[PDB]
């Protein structure tokens, strides 16, 4: 029962992530009653994660039934919502890293730049940029039933051998290369700037707190890069025209897909729960 184990893992990850995301969304929306930029970014991330986790109940049924009985419209809706919300999550995390870098490295101009309305406008821009990529892929994607088996997949325009690798390389570069580089450079400069500050390096206990902060940043970057590296590698390999001839490769694709969704469900624990302000709200009630 390999497929049964994969579907059960999908259900467990989906239920846990949905529970955490709904708690974070509801508490930030009403319970906290505080208007700050960071809350808006965390709320946007949690909403994107919830929309991502909506996709999994249909994929599990697809794997169990061995075909797609939902239809063409639902196939397009699933593909659009999944790729769109993934891109939205990635860019939202990149925006949070850039926001923290601007806040810490340049404190004089941080004041006016950081505002709830401005952060909301940046988020709206992120969603619009996600829509620009989202819509053609949603158009191309469809369900095909050549020999009594219905499969929900994206259609590569003719010729496949040329358009397909370019498409895969562009998705790989935008999804992976630019955010990882921006996050790593900004966080490294931020850690060096925090070391530069005389307040953090004043005493051994403050130095220990700085160690905690640097280790937390390194853990977040390591978890993100490690979780999303295999999915991007396998998708780039499928893009290059490599064709799996064994069931085991499909099983690796499934497990790595679930490993990719582990970071998406993990994200509220990584960001919201560790955040001191949210902890302060949690202690009160």
């Amino acid at each position: 029962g390999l497929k049964v184990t994969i579907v059960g893992l999908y259900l467990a990850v989906c239920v846990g992530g949905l529970l955490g995301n709904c708690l974070v969304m509801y508490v930030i929306l009403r319970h906290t009653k505080m208007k700050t930029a960071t809350n808006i970014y965390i709320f946007n991330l949690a909403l994107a994660d919830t929309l991502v986790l909506l996709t999994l109940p249909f994929q599990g049924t697809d794997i169990l039934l061995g075909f797609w009985p939902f239809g063409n419209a639902l196939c397009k809706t699933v593909i659009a919502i999944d790729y769109y919300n993934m891109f939205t999550s990635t860019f939202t995390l990149t925006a949070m890293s850039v926001d923290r870098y601007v806040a810490i490295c340049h404190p004089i101009r941080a004041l006016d730049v950081r505002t709830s309305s401005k952060a909301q406008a940046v988020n709206v821009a992120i969603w619009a940029l996600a829509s620009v990529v989202g819509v053609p892929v949603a158009i191309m994607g469809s369900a095909q039933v050549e020999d009594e088996e219905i499969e929900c997949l994206v259609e590569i325009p003719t010729p496949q051998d040329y358009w397909g690798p370019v498409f895969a390389i562009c998705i790989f570069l935008f999804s992976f290369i630019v955010p990882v580089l921006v996050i790593s450079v900004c966080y490294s400069l931020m850690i060096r700037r925090l070391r530069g500050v005389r307040l953090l390096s004043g005493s051994r206990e403050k130095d220990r707190n700085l160690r905690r902060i640097t280790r937390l940043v390194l853990v977040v970057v390591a978890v993100f890069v490690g979780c999303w590296t295999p999915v991007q590698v396998f998708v780039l390999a499928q893009g290059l025209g490599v064709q799996p001839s064994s069931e085991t490769a499909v099983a690796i694709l499934r497990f790595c897909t679930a490993l990719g969704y582990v970071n998406s469900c993990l994200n509220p624990i990584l960001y919201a729960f560790l955040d001191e302000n949210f902890k302060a709200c949690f202690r009160k009630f």
Partner: peptide, 14 residues
């Protein structure tokens, strides 16, 4: 992401 690749199609053909 990566679920709707068509890898299962290629596996079925080969």
């Amino acid at each position: 992401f990566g679920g709707f690749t068509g890898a299962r199609k290629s596996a079925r053909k080969l």
